[PDB]
Design a protein around this nucleic acid. Sequence first.
DNA 1: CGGCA
DNA 2: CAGTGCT
DNA 3: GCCG
DNA 4: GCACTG
Length: 330
Amino acid sequence: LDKWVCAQPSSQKATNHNLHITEKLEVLAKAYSVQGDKWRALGYAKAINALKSFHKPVTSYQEACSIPGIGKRMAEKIIEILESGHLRKLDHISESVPVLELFSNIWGAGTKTAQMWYQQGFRSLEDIRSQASLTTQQAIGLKHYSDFLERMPREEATEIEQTVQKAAQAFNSGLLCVACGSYRRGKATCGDVDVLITHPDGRSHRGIFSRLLDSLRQEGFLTDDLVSQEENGQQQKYLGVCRLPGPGRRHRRLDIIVVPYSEFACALLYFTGSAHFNRSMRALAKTKGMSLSEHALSTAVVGRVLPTPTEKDVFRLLGLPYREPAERDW
DNA sequence: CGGCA
DNA sequence: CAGTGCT
DNA sequence: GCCG
DNA sequence: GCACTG
Ligand SMILES: [Cl-]
Ligand SMILES: [Cl-]
Ligand SMILES: [Cl-]
Ligand SMILES: [Mg+2]
Ligand SMILES: [Mg+2]
Ligand code: NA
Ligand code: NA
Ligand code: NA
């Protein structure tokens, strides 16, 4: 259980005794990430969380290696930072990295697109604006480049959730709407608003996206759509852009998912996160012959759907102590 | 060796 | 399909 | 990158 | 681990 972050309270990270190491490893992790070396970046991310939650400063190679998520290679970097006070590799990061980061912060452009733009000789967002072929999504991402990098005060997230909730409950008063993600984890600021909608009767959630989105469009609240498959009525998620009325308002990212009540606990767990919390819990489930998604906790395929009326039941079935949302902030 | 949700 | 983004 |  | 695009 010591190996599994989902088995531990994330508040362990608030007392980071190894910041002089993790702040340097994070620069490298991001460099690998924007260049597309996702599995190396993942190992760094896990090592960083292991160091942030360790109970004391790491002071020896043998100690480092004993920490789950720290291997020989990561231990060698820790020992270099201890003795020398710096990590040499930080002076030998590819020169493309700042531009690759700039480009991949465009919503809809990932590492593959950023690398292509870089190969084509683009170096600034002015180059992208004037010379790149953008997808519909990437054009919206570029238009809102600064705003999508800003976090909003949680009070604004509340107002956005209430806007969605009021529009939804106007045509079915029994709909349940809950803000998840970083909001539900109690953070003071939110990168976007994640709204989960369901109905306790098990059926009235169906078909509401069309009416809800059109209602939110009628009042001008939705300003741009990033992902919204509205043609066949099977839509599960909406990803888009909103802006509250009045002066001093920024465009904000809004994600909505509509789910059947029978999947409420698993959808709430998924959408509350954190992302690394979810990945940890899902990896653990695999070791127990199970698979965890936003739909269900199931047994391995030939599977059976296990009964999970509440988040606590998912924890229980995986042998984990329950964590309130604020303690899932990995 | 291969997954890493 | 490859690429992307959600947590 | 680290893990089993 | 899944739901999207083109
Ligand atoms: Cl590099
Ligand atoms: Cl009603
Ligand atoms: Cl619950
Ligand atoms: Mg969010
Ligand atoms: Mg979101
Ligand atoms: Na280790
Ligand atoms: Na991006
Ligand atoms: Na974010």
